[PDB]
Amino acid sequence: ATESPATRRVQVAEHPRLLKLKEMFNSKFGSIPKFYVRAPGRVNIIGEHIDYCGYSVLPMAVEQDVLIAVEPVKTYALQLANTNPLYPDFSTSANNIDKTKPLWHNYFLCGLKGIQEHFGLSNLTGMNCLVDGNIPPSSGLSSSSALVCCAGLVTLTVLGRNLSKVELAEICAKSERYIGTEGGGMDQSISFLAEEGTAKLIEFSPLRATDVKLPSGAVFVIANSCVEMNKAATSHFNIRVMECRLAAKLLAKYKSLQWDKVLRLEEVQAKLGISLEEMLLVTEDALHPEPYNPEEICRCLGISLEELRTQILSPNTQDVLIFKLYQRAKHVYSEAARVLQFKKICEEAPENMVQLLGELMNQSHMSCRDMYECSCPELDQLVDICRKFGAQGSRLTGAGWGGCTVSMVPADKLPSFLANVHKAYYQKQSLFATKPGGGALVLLEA
Ligand SMILES: Nc1ncnc2c1ncn2[C@@H]1O[C@H](COP(=O)(O)OP(=O)(O)O)[C@@H](O)[C@H]1O
Ligand SMILES: CC(=O)N[C@H]1[C@@H](OP(=O)(O)O)O[C@H](CO)[C@H](O)[C@@H]1O
Ligand SMILES: [Cl-]
Ligand SMILES: [Mg+2]
């Protein structure tokens, strides 16, 4: 709708975290914070690597979040600090993102920048901020987005301007891209739009969030592989985006569309008016399974190597020489269908629901592992263990190449799953049960 992030009264005393934030802020800046902002991380139940392709996804917010204590100031200076020494203090007074190197404060700046630009503001929003995030970083739980989103909300609030949760999501999804990742809007959308007690089907263009009621007899558990993967510091992520972009263009061309304008896999389907099942057949016909090379792509599209490199590919991807068009498209179209089916099942709630939902997750994991090639040994091993121990469904979550897994565990298997999994892979940080949490909020002291 037009609804904005809520502002809630809390008793600092009851929240070890805010108390701590409060006290450290005062010691750090000499004054108590005027307000706080929280933006949660999230677990994607199913629908991996498709948001940027324009397809609907099914995440839910987790409890872990990024919490920021704030104090507006008159100077046009931004002073940032973190409760974790791993993240150095930083200050700026700049009127106008390096993306030469991913320093933590640049994620905060992406968020601030999106907001200031949205309002055509040139000057820096003056403030003192102390950051505390408890989402395991670079683990597929969107710690980067929680930070960007929290920073955007902070900025908005300091500016005293208004934005709906939807616009916040839209703006943050584009601003995070200044860090250099060419991802989608799932993470930012769920961070602002989540509601406690329900997952959301997040659809794009236009952005809409729809409640999805999860199975009553099973519990979702996150288990971190503990292999860290920093999306902004590596090229893996963007290569996949490009492969999809290129696949979309070739598909369009093969179907005689105006491919030059095409950027996403979903557009092709949309333009053709066919079903996802049908898009798989088109894919099968239009894209050869063996990889594509730059020169071949260039000949197919009727463009130049230079056009490709500078006009289509991203800087961090201009020297890619192997494009797995077929596999990426196949993963995408099949995965977008799985999300739709998962939602349908949750709504109809058949008897064998957990089982069916579980199968969809397992199918998702194998497509990610085999077709999108975004899993890793540790993830595969953990997923096996989860299943061994009771998970009806288990798969990697978030971008992959390390990070977390998400398992759907029957209630009765819960206690044993946890102990067994722990014992098996880890010999509440890396392994913990979760449930659908609420979205980003503004906090004022009770
Ligand atoms: N609590 C935190 N404090 C400061 N920066 C953080 C925090 N959590 C995440 N970040 C930033 O986000 C980066 C991780 O982003 P990313 O690789 O996209 O992981 P994720 O899968 O969690 O979104 C970190 O390297 C750090 O720069
Ligand atoms: C800000 C960003 O790019 N996040 C993207 C990234 O998630 P994570 O950084 O693992 O949370 O990968 C997932 C894979 O489904 C989506 O593509 C999403 O849009
Ligand atoms: Cl850093
Ligand atoms: Mg991220």
Ligand code: NA
């Ligand atoms: Na749409």
